[PDB]
Design a protein around this ligand. Structure first.
Ligand code: NA
Length: 321
């Protein structure tokens, strides 16, 4: 395959990137604490947001509302409005670096995970933490909501990938439960479902396929593992072998039978979904890769590395959507 580079931002080290769903924009999160907003079609810096002390890693747009969320070294989960360019509020509760933060696709929730070994779910309309998911025994490097089921997947330096059942939390809103405040005691929602144990080093990333019942995980063992599941069980399918340093990030191509991964070995690698064979490698001479993302609808990719960010399309080699 070949990379058709649409945009590059040259900068100090970048840690995260987020596509806007409809505008030709990316947010970037930088090790220096700044968040950049770029129009990648024209190559224009639209805005820069300074709301963090120290590195920012988590960054994501809301899928339909004019908001984004950010998190990093200063422990706070910040909610911004990009139209008013305001930092609206900060959600506090994490006790260490926030690695990932995202919005749910339907419920008014933010998911965050942290070096404090927890995952938190927040209600961004009430501005309260509604669940703390404990059990990992080292940094939680990644967490993601499942796109259609009441599940979360998380990855940790404790060498495990966890799938959590959050159906109890979802059902709480509409339950016919009433409370007389004068009769309360002095003052379940999330349970771990699978503890996937296959990695023998720390795990840096995990991803759900947007439509198929598949999970990818990757980490310090240099491996990308593919898992499949039903409502009642999961299984390890295969491993993509070849990276020669820590794997930072991995994802599914939504519309082709391909897996992508990115690594401190200075490569982005494409693999066949059905056979796990190597399809194509792309390299940078001087830059480790920290993150990759795919646009949900367009076949457009972005990567964060030691010297900035790139936005690109992937095409079959020698082919001159
Ligand atoms: Na996702």
């Amino acid at each position: 395959m070949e990379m058709l580079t649409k945009f590059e931002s040259r900068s100090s080290r970048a840690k995260g990137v987020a596509f806007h769903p409809t505008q030709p924009w990316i947010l970037t999160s930088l090790h220096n604490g700044r968040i950049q907003l770029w129009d990648y079609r024209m190559g224009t810096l639209l805005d820069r947001f300074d709301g963090h002390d120290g590195p920012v890693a988590g960054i994501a747009f809301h899928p339909t509302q004019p908001l984004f969320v950010s998190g990093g070294d200063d422990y706070k989960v910040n909610v911004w409005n990009y139209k008013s360019r305001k930092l609206l509020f900060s959600l506090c509760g994490h006790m260490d670096y926030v690695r990932v933060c995202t919005f749910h696709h339907e419920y008014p929730w933010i998911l965050s995970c942290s070096d404090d070994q927890t995952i938190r779910i927040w209600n961004w309309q009430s501005r309260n933490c509604i669940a703390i998911l404990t059990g990992h025994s080292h940094y939680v490097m990644c967490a993601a909501f499942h796109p259609s089921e009441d599940l979360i997947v998380s990855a940790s330096l404790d060498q495990t990938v966890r799938v959590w059942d959050i159906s109890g939390l979802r059902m709480k809103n509409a339950a016919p439960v009433s409370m007389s405040k004068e009769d309360q005691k002095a003052q379940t929602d999330a349970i771990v479902k699978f503890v996937l144990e296959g990695h023998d080093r720390g795990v840096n990333w995990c991803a759900f396929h947007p439509t198929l019942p598949l999970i990818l995980s990757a980490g310090d063992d240099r491996l990308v593992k593919l898992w499949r599941m039903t409502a009642s069980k999961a299984w390890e399918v295969d491993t993509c072998r070849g990276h020669f340093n820590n794997v930072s990030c991995c994802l599914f191509h939504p519309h082709q039978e391909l897996i992508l991964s990115a690594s401190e070995d200075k490569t982005i690698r494409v693999w066949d979904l059905n056979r796990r064979t190597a399809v194509q490698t792309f390299r940078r001479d001087n830059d480790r890769f920290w993150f990759i993302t795919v646009h949900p609808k367009l076949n457009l990719f972005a990567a964060a590395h030691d010297s900035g960010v790139m936005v690109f399309k992937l095409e079959s080699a020698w082919s001159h959507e």
